[PDB]
Design a protein around this ligand. Sequence first.
Ligand code: OJJ
Length: 305
Amino acid sequence: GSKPNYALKFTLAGHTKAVSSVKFSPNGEWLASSSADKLIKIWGAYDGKFEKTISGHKLGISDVAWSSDSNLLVSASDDKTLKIWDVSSGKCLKTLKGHSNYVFCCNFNPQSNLIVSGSFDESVRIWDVKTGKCLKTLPAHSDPVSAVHFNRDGSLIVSSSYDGLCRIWDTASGQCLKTLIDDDNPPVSFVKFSPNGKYILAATLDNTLKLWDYSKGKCLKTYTGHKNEKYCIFANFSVTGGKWIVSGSEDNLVYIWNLQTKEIVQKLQGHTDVVISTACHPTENIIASAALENDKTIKLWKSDC
Ligand SMILES: COC(=O)N(CCCCc1nc(CO)c[nH]1)Cc1ccccc1
């Protein structure tokens, strides 16, 4: 109960370069993986069964995100585009063009009528899904944008940058609501809202995770013990069993913390390169983890708690 007991169930091989992200569909039936090999792969969430490859990007992919109804994906690519995909058909519906450098991060709003993107071009863009047109270009940061995420009602966007800032944006106007983290340094490598939209989980490249109260703009919790000085490693709120914080690490482990106590409650051993990305199953106590170039595999882990 008080600790999870995640154990390896499946290893998913198929990517020929570093995996860049993994995401479970909201309906829980699929895992989507993006890679430097320019491919998206779709896997059975429960049995890790390879479903299909989705291809079309001309260069490597840094991120993929699911629509709310689990019917679409958006990918962010070094080819300076995002692509919206129909998962069923595997077809590119739209190519989102406007970024002037690598597109690093992406997400749909809960309504799934918008996509938010972050680029090496230091901008955040908001896209209309239906038309594939850019609605707003936000001069968000003074260095590459590491993460973008909408809160639970779609009214807010949180961004992070190598400029060391975390900023929250009014979706409707694109105007800045507050700069949460305002330090020269270190680089903010990842941010996302908590499921209730009250808190922001932020990674910094000083081996630190911080849980911020958005309203008060104050740090509540710090999570340490893992290695993170180079890569934009995802972090998750695990909510299906015990309330954990989950992250990859440059020491090739998955770290699990107790959200409240900040104690490490498990380290998952198995990968042979940096764990860049972790995802938590929406219903079951299942973690997916993905590793860089030496490894190029995705691991599915299952816990009783
Ligand atoms: C600093 O850049 C990186 O973290 N990577 C890892 C892959 C992308 C991971 C990623 N996190 C996010 C956080 O929003 C989006 N995408 C790029 C990379 C790929 C392959 C080899 C070396 C570096």
